[PDB]
Amino acid sequence: TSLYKGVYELQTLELNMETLNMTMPLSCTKNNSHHYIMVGNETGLELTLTNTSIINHKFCNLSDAHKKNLYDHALMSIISTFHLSIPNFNQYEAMSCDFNGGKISVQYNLSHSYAGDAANHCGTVANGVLQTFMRMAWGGSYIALDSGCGNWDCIMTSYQYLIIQNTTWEDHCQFSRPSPIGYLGLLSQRTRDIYIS
Amino acid sequence: TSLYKGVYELQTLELNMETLNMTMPLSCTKNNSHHYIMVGNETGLELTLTNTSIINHKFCNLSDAHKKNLYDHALMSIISTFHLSIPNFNQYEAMSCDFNGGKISVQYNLSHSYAGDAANHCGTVANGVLQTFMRMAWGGSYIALDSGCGNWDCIMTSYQYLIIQNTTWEDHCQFSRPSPIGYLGLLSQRTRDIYIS
Amino acid sequence: TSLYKGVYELQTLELNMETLNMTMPLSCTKNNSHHYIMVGNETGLELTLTNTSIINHKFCNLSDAHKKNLYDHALMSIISTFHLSIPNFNQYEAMSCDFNGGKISVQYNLSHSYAGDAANHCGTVANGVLQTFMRMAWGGSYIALDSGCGNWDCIMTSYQYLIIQNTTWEDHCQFSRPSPIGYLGLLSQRTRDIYIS
Amino acid sequence: GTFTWTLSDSEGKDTPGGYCLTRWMLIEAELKCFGNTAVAKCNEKHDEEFCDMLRLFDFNKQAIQRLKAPAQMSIQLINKAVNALINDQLIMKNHLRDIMCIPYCNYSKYWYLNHTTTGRTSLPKCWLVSNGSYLNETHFSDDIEQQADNMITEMLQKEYMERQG
Amino acid sequence: GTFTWTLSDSEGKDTPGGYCLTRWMLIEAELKCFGNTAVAKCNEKHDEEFCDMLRLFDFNKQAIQRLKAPAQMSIQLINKAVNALINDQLIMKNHLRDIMCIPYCNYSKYWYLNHTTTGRTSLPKCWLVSNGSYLNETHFSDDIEQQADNMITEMLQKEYMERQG
Amino acid sequence: GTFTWTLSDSEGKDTPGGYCLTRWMLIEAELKCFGNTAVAKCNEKHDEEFCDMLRLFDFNKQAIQRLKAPAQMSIQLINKAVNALINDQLIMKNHLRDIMCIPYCNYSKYWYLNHTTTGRTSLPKCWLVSNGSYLNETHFSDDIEQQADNMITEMLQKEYMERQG
Ligand SMILES: *[C@@H]1O[C@H](CO)[C@@H](O[C@@H]2O[C@H](CO)[C@@H](O[C@@H]3O[C@H](CO[C@H]4O[C@H](CO)[C@@H](O)[C@H](O)[C@@H]4O)[C@@H](O)[C@H](O[C@H]4O[C@H](CO)[C@@H](O)[C@H](O)[C@@H]4O)[C@@H]3O)[C@H](O)[C@H]2NC(C)=O)[C@H](O)[C@H]1NC(C)=O
Ligand SMILES: *[C@@H]1O[C@H](CO)[C@@H](O[C@@H]2O[C@H](CO)[C@@H](O[C@@H]3O[C@H](CO[C@H]4O[C@H](CO)[C@@H](O)[C@H](O)[C@@H]4O)[C@@H](O)[C@H](O[C@H]4O[C@H](CO)[C@@H](O)[C@H](O)[C@@H]4O)[C@@H]3O)[C@H](O)[C@H]2NC(C)=O)[C@H](O)[C@H]1NC(C)=O
Ligand SMILES: *[C@@H]1O[C@H](CO)[C@@H](O[C@@H]2O[C@H](CO)[C@@H](O[C@@H]3O[C@H](CO[C@H]4O[C@H](CO)[C@@H](O)[C@H](O)[C@@H]4O)[C@@H](O)[C@H](O[C@H]4O[C@H](CO)[C@@H](O)[C@H](O)[C@@H]4O)[C@@H]3O)[C@H](O)[C@H]2NC(C)=O)[C@H](O)[C@H]1NC(C)=O
Ligand SMILES: *[C@@H]1O[C@H](CO)[C@@H](O[C@@H]2O[C@H](CO)[C@@H](O[C@@H]3O[C@H](CO)[C@@H](O)[C@H](O)[C@@H]3O)[C@H](O)[C@H]2NC(C)=O)[C@H](O)[C@H]1NC(C)=O
Ligand SMILES: *[C@@H]1O[C@H](CO)[C@@H](O[C@@H]2O[C@H](CO)[C@@H](O[C@@H]3O[C@H](CO)[C@@H](O)[C@H](O)[C@@H]3O)[C@H](O)[C@H]2NC(C)=O)[C@H](O)[C@H]1NC(C)=O
Ligand SMILES: *[C@@H]1O[C@H](CO[C@@H]2O[C@@H](C)[C@@H](O)[C@@H](O)[C@@H]2O)[C@@H](O[C@@H]2O[C@H](CO)[C@@H](O)[C@H](O)[C@H]2NC(C)=O)[C@H](O)[C@H]1NC(C)=O
Ligand SMILES: *[C@@H]1O[C@H](CO[C@@H]2O[C@@H](C)[C@@H](O)[C@@H](O)[C@@H]2O)[C@@H](O[C@@H]2O[C@H](CO)[C@@H](O)[C@H](O)[C@H]2NC(C)=O)[C@H](O)[C@H]1NC(C)=O
Ligand SMILES: *[C@@H]1O[C@H](CO[C@@H]2O[C@@H](C)[C@@H](O)[C@@H](O)[C@@H]2O)[C@@H](O[C@@H]2O[C@H](CO)[C@@H](O)[C@H](O)[C@H]2NC(C)=O)[C@H](O)[C@H]1NC(C)=O
Ligand SMILES: *[C@@H]1O[C@H](CO)[C@@H](O[C@@H]2O[C@H](CO)[C@@H](O)[C@H](O)[C@H]2NC(C)=O)[C@H](O)[C@H]1NC(C)=O
Ligand SMILES: *[C@@H]1O[C@H](CO)[C@@H](O[C@@H]2O[C@H](CO)[C@@H](O)[C@H](O)[C@H]2NC(C)=O)[C@H](O)[C@H]1NC(C)=O
Ligand SMILES: *[C@@H]1O[C@H](CO)[C@@H](O[C@@H]2O[C@H](CO)[C@@H](O)[C@H](O)[C@H]2NC(C)=O)[C@H](O)[C@H]1NC(C)=O
Ligand SMILES: *[C@@H]1O[C@H](CO)[C@@H](O[C@@H]2O[C@H](CO)[C@@H](O)[C@H](O)[C@H]2NC(C)=O)[C@H](O)[C@H]1NC(C)=O
Ligand SMILES: *[C@@H]1O[C@H](CO)[C@@H](O[C@@H]2O[C@H](CO)[C@@H](O)[C@H](O)[C@H]2NC(C)=O)[C@H](O)[C@H]1NC(C)=O
Ligand SMILES: *[C@@H]1O[C@H](CO)[C@@H](O[C@@H]2O[C@H](CO)[C@@H](O)[C@H](O)[C@H]2NC(C)=O)[C@H](O)[C@H]1NC(C)=O
Ligand SMILES: *[C@@H]1O[C@H](CO)[C@@H](O[C@@H]2O[C@H](CO)[C@@H](O)[C@H](O)[C@H]2NC(C)=O)[C@H](O)[C@H]1NC(C)=O
Ligand SMILES: *[C@@H]1O[C@H](CO)[C@@H](O[C@@H]2O[C@H](CO)[C@@H](O)[C@H](O)[C@H]2NC(C)=O)[C@H](O)[C@H]1NC(C)=O
Ligand SMILES: *[C@@H]1O[C@H](CO)[C@@H](O[C@@H]2O[C@H](CO)[C@@H](O)[C@H](O)[C@H]2NC(C)=O)[C@H](O)[C@H]1NC(C)=O
């Protein structure tokens, strides 16, 4: 390559973040419709954008799940980090869960990209949930939006639901290099966008 | 002016924060009894200290307002930032609201500067609400207190209510230069003074 | 002592943190079973690890205490800081209180070091409460654990209850130098380990 | 971009030796240009106060020119800008000084030294206030003299090294 | 330990002049060793980006070798490591640049200058991306040239002072 | 005020070359004065540990002398002082080192080097502990030698420039 000032060779370095799996979660993409968060070499979450309507009730039995604690605390912690990072999340009926003991089973209803709230306007529930999604899958999530860069409040997708389910570790990642940055960026939220009750 | 070391002229610079209106709110004063927070060049909040008793019920219908979302999210966000920054706010019956759809209508009852809580002692509800007020209107709010600098817990005013209402943009500001610092200082709260339930 | 490079004498300095009592709380130890947090030169909290079962009901009357405000706000603030810093505190029935007006009276039930939650496994309620305890009494708390350094999630003690009660100032501290660091470290929590409802 | 404090990657495509503050961001100033030597100093965090406003002005401009203006504030966006750009300890310290009756930064008026024959200037420092008004010039004598010595020292050291290496 | 950026107190019990990145943490690199002169720079906070990964790699290793691996992630532990080791303003700035359509750090590819006869290298800088791909080399010409001048300056100043004192 | 680390604006109205620690804040020390050259170093953030205590002592004093003592702690005030004055990464790192079985800062005992004929001293560094006790002197040999070289270097560079410019 190019020689700078007649004495320096430009050289590059690429870091392998795949060896950080034992201490921190790694986020990656696969094909837009699917993104993954892996922990260790055993399990993780599958984040999908799909027209599937898998949960058909309007409530999340969290307190019940906490009493029947049959779940991996690491996965619940990651999900909580995701949930609590959704700015201005007012539409609680849009979040439904079916833990059934140890499953994750979490569904966010963004139907028609406003989920019944008024109309598909900018700055709505879909925007709130999608911004967190885009950050959690920052390694690669840009493929999800065609126009969102020019106006951050008009992030909209066509998919009706954001589905979070637990899966096993598989070599799921492609189209990118697994990275903890999305997750780390969410942990250091600092400012929370919370409306008064 | 003065020449330093025989070679430097002291010079001054004054920044115009009035051109930051499109991206961040600007706080200013007017006549103690009134302070303002303006957004863009269209609207904002009028913060007043007055013996008016405008809301005559003891509740704030926030969940109802969130379902009937006829409000500017920017104003609700600013108000929330204010509310959640009141340290040790235990007296919930002191906060009353009447959104009536799209209005702000927020009243904080500091009557007799303790609002019925014991007596007008230092470190009470009036102090909590006023400290946040003093910071939100930091550009200029010092005119509100005659003795508070010598003992931060004895900030007291004579006015019974802190009223927050939405208004239109008008060139309201005088006695100071509009500045985002109060607001920015509140966003970076870092530590929250919250008692256990 | 040793002379470095032939010209410097190594010298030491020891700071007296006991003179910081008027503006910040100081934490110290005494005999493992007891630790203290002192404020000013008048009062403070006694933190104990004991098989005493002092509170025999499963609830904490906080809202009632807030209405009947007969308590030192400083002590309530310190306790709140402690409580809100317990990661993943799901077992609410484990926290019982009897303020009776102005007392602190706070009991955390870690019985059998899982408090009835499954079995005495790593990463449980005892671990959550003890990690906060260990930090609040960081000046000296290491005497509490024989093996915890090798695995932070397996911090366990044999004592059934963590008891927090208010006492008077006495020269309680021994085995260490009073220090605000534990408390300060808890105030700057930054990241909160909170599960979804 | 010679300024790590800015968001733009095109910041350096301007007068190589100076950064200019437009007339629009100043009060009756018309034009103020500071040497890049001084402006670049806040690439490092020095708890400088002045560059917190420059970071907000830089943000403000980028948020207007690169994005379609949303025309709805996007408070949720400024919130991230604040956490990324603002020195919180400085705001809190000025707050503490205010409430502790200690002179503090107003975030409006700044002062700098301007060399009378070279046109070289210092980075600006915040003019302090106390009890509703500005502190008198005499109370800044020590600060001004030190700033003047710092500039003299830099000029001499620069000249020394140009001659030496 | 010559590195205040590390957690280990045994960090300096290695080649006195260099810090090595194991083959295991690199992608097809086999071995990369950077001089301690450059690596030690991030003992100070310079919003460098590269050393945030080094701090995570250092943490990761210490968390594995000194503790019994819990084999259960201990997310509650990484959370403290993050707050202690990570520069949050940099992550937020790269986020803002991304959403504001400004080239930003990928946290994968880095570049550095390597002197062709001495083997001395610069601390690495993050290679920027924009719209799904990497920026072309021409857009880094200014950054590379400045880094090259910084290294030249350091070599000359070092030589100057070795001769002078 | 030559110290940007302090809250007081009258900090410099004292011995121009030194900052003194009163007998009241020390354990059986009677009097300790450190040169301003070294004390002023923590005007910049170096993750120094020692000056976090100095900032608390400075705060503590200002909070007592300028305000009517409220005599009720004002925990809500210390909370702001903490966020403005304390280096959180250092506390968290010492916490992590403790729980990771790595020697860490006790925030009590500090050491410094004292030149035997000039009386000039270094800024103090925190003495480390591990498993209930203090680390032995031999384990600090590398740190002490480096600090000694840093002081020697500074003395020589100062002398060099006094002669040169
Ligand atoms: C920083 O920015 C860059 C720019 O996008 C991102 O770049 C991606 O990097 C990842 C790896 O970290 C790339 O993933 C791999 O790309 C290979 C590209 O090979 C091409 O050419 C071969 C020729 O035979 C084709 O076969 C192939 O299809 C491509 O056309 C793929 O070959 C790799 O696939 C292999 O590995 C994956 C797992 O990693 C397996 O699932 C596959 O079966 C196969 O074994 C792989 O896809 C990605 O392509 C890069 N994209 C681009 C456009 O550069 C970085 O990810 C980003 N870093 C971060 C995290 O910010
Ligand atoms: C930093 O600290 C300083 C010190 O208080 C604060 O100073 C204030 O700065 C604001 C402007 O930013 C000043 O506001 C303006 O003051 C003018 C003063 O003029 C005087 O003399 C004329 C002579 O004819 C009189 O007419 C006038 O009444 C005054 O006696 C006013 O003239 C200005 O009024 C005009 O503009 C306002 C809108 O800005 C209009 O509403 C009016 O109708 C009129 O057109 C204006 O009031 C303020 O006076 C300053 N106070 C002092 C004591 O200095 C800074 O605000 C502060 N900065 C921050 C934000 O920290
Ligand atoms: C940093 O790390 C060090 C290492 O542990 C901690 O060290 C402790 O420091 C505290 C003081 O800050 C020590 O407390 C005092 O220790 C004295 C030790 O004296 C010994 O020798 C005499 C000989 O007659 C014996 O009588 C005595 O029992 C000891 O064997 C005690 O004498 C002191 O007791 C006196 O003061 C206390 C109150 O301080 C009174 O309650 C007593 O009645 C008596 O008057 C006192 O105990 C402690 O011993 C040190 N431990 C060790 C092993 O060094 C620092 O605390 C730590 N700093 C922090 C906060 O991180
Ligand atoms: C609200 O904020 C805007 C900044 O976003 C404030 O400033 C005004 O902004 C417009 C658009 O950039 C400027 O327009 C320009 O005018 C010059 C005139 O010579 C022209 O050459 C340019 O092509 C362009 O049209 C306008 O000058 C500027 N005005 C200023 C700084 O005075 C606006 O003033 C703020 N409004 C309120 C109520 O605070
Ligand atoms: C999950 O994380 C681990 C790191 O904790 C990843 O790397 C593998 O870690 C093991 C244990 O340290 C390495 O074992 C060593 O192999 C060498 C081979 O020459 C041997 O000499 C040593 O004595 C030791 O046995 C292993 O090499 C290393 N593999 C790498 C970096 O490729 C692991 O790959 C991660 N797994 C997943 C699914 O991501
Ligand atoms: C997922 O759905 C969206 C939105 O379509 C709605 O929901 C569907 C499940 C179905 O009930 C439709 O009748 C609803 O209208 C699909 O996106 C397209 O959106 C544009 C407007 O933005 C609309 O004009 C198109 O007709 C929609 N496409 C179709 C086939 O109707 C999206 O393509 C669906 N994705 C998948 C994988 O099915
Ligand atoms: C606002 O009210 C305060 C407090 O007065 C009380 O509330 C009034 C509405 C009325 O019901 C009074 O009878 C109540 O006592 C006024 O402040 C003064 O406070 C001092 C003690 O600090 C008291 O001795 C004075 O009598 C009060 N002033 C008056 C006229 O009673 C304050 O002035 C009122 N402000 C306005 C604009 O009306
Ligand atoms: C506090 O209790 C623990 C745990 O013992 C249980 O609770 C007691 C109050 C009593 O009801 C016991 O029968 C319960 O088993 C004591 O710790 C020991 O724990 C080990 C296992 O880790 C067990 O084998 C021992 O038998 C327990 N010790 C005794 C005497 O039973 C702890 O010692 C008690 N501490 C004090 C001060 O009483
Ligand atoms: C979530 O909790 C509700 C109760 O709060 C569960 O609904 C009850 O289910 C039982 C049968 O198991 C019925 O007899 C009750 O009449 C139901 N009550 C209500 C209000 O519907 C619900 O099944 C739980 N769901 C999940 C996914 O755990
Ligand atoms: C989500 O996690 C749970 C718990 O790890 C998985 O449930 C286990 O599945 C195996 C195989 O079917 C059973 O033998 C276990 O008894 C189940 N345990 C529990 C607590 O239910 C579940 O399969 C995972 N989800 C997915 C999609 O793999
Ligand atoms: C997800 O949310 C949408 C929007 O609220 C639900 O769609 C509504 O369904 C009812 C009953 O079929 C219709 O009367 C409404 O008109 C639909 N709303 C809109 C905007 O078309 C949808 O049922 C929810 N899905 C799940 C699985 O809960
Ligand atoms: C806040 O909500 C309460 C209900 O929770 C509203 O009060 C009810 O108003 C209807 C008439 O619209 C009456 O028939 C009910 O009897 C009232 N219930 C109670 C408990 O008072 C109240 O009006 C709402 N207020 C605002 C400002 O929105
Ligand atoms: C607070 O904001 C609301 C909404 O922007 C304002 O209400 C509007 O007022 C105009 C003029 O009276 C009506 O034509 C609109 O239909 C109203 N909209 C709604 C949603 O009610 C309200 O006037 C503002 N408050 C003040 C004091 O100006
Ligand atoms: C604001 O709060 C005050 C204080 O609680 C209320 O004043 C009380 O009113 C009742 C009924 O008139 C009296 O019996 C009490 O003695 C008053 N309290 C005191 C301390 O004098 C006031 O009504 C509230 N105002 C509004 C609009 O809610
Ligand atoms: C905590 O609050 C409960 C009520 O929510 C108190 O229990 C009541 O006590 C009265 C007598 O004072 C009885 O008549 C009621 O029947 C009790 N109700 C219930 C639900 O038990 C309880 O005593 C309070 N405890 C403390 C420590 O304050
Ligand atoms: C905890 O604090 C309360 C309030 O400061 C103490 O209660 C006081 O005790 C004295 C002596 O018995 C009584 O004269 C007071 O009337 C009590 N005040 C209240 C509000 O109850 C209590 O003693 C302290 N706890 C301990 C263990 O000392
Ligand atoms: C503290 O918690 C323990 C654990 O939940 C309680 O112990 C239980 O007591 C009941 C009734 O005696 C027994 O049937 C259970 O078997 C006990 N649990 C276990 C694990 O042995 C204890 O009573 C609670 N103490 C207080 C003061 O609330």
Residue numbers in the entry:
A (entry chain A), B (entry chain B), C (entry chain C): 59 to 255
D (entry chain b), E (entry chain a), F (entry chain c): 260 to 424
Text lifted from the article:
The LASV glycoprotein complex (GPC) mediates viral entry and is the sole target for neutralizing antibodies. In its mature, native form, GPC is a trimer of heterotrimers comprised of the receptor-engaging subunit GP1; the transmembrane-spanning subunit GP2, which contains the GPC’s fusion peptide at its N terminus; and the stable signal peptide (SSP), which remains non-covalently complexed near the membrane-proximal region of GP2 post-cleavage. The GPC is expressed as a single polypeptide precursor before being proteolytically processed by signal peptidase (SPase)21 followed by site-1 protease (S1P). We present the development and characterization of prefusion-stabilized, trimeric GPCs of LASV lineages II, V, and VII, revealing structural conservation despite sequence diversity.
Building on our previous success using the I53-50A scaffold to stabilize the Josiah strain GPC ectodomain, we explored whether the same strategy could stabilize additional GPC trimers of diverse LASV lineages. To ensure stabilization of the prefusion state, we introduced the GPCysR4 mutations. These mutations comprise the introduction of a disulfide bond between GP1 and GP2, a proline in the HR1 helix, and the replacement of the native LASV GPC S1P cleavage site with a furin cleavage site. Combined, these approaches enabled us to determine the structures of GPC in a reproducible manner and yielded structures of LIV, LII, LV, and LVII GPC trimers at resolutions of 3.8, 3.7, 3.7, and 3.1 Å, respectively. The GPC-I53-50A constructs recapitulate the known GPC structural features and domain organization. The GP2 subunit demonstrates the canonical HR1a–d helices, T-loop, and HR2 helix. Our GPC-I53-50A shows high similarity, as measured by the root-mean-square deviation (RMSD) of a GPC protomer, to those previously described (0.80 Å among 300 pruned atom pairs, 2.4 Å overall fit across 341 sequence-aligned pairs with PDB: 5VK230 and 1.1 Å among 254 pruned atom pairs, 2.9 Å across 341 sequence-aligned pairs with PDB: 7PVD24; Figure S6A). In the ligand-free structures of GPC-I53-50As, the fusion peptide appears to flexibly occupy the space enclosed by the HR1a helix of the same protomer and the HR1d and HR2 loop of its adjacent protomer. In contrast, previously described structures of GPC bound to 18.5C, 37.7H, and 25.6A of the GPC-B competition group, 25.10C of the GPC-A competition group, and full-length GPC bound to matriglycan show that the fusion peptide occupies the same approximate area, yet extends inward and reaches toward the apex of the trimer near the GP1 C-terminal domain. When comparing the on-rate of IgG binding to an immobilized GPC, we observed that the LIV GPC-I53-50A had the highest overall binding efficiency to the tested NAbs. GPC-I53-50A with a furin cleavage site (GPCysR4-I53-50A) was unable to bind the matriglycan array; however, LIV GPC-I53-50A featuring the native S1P cleavage site showed potent binding.
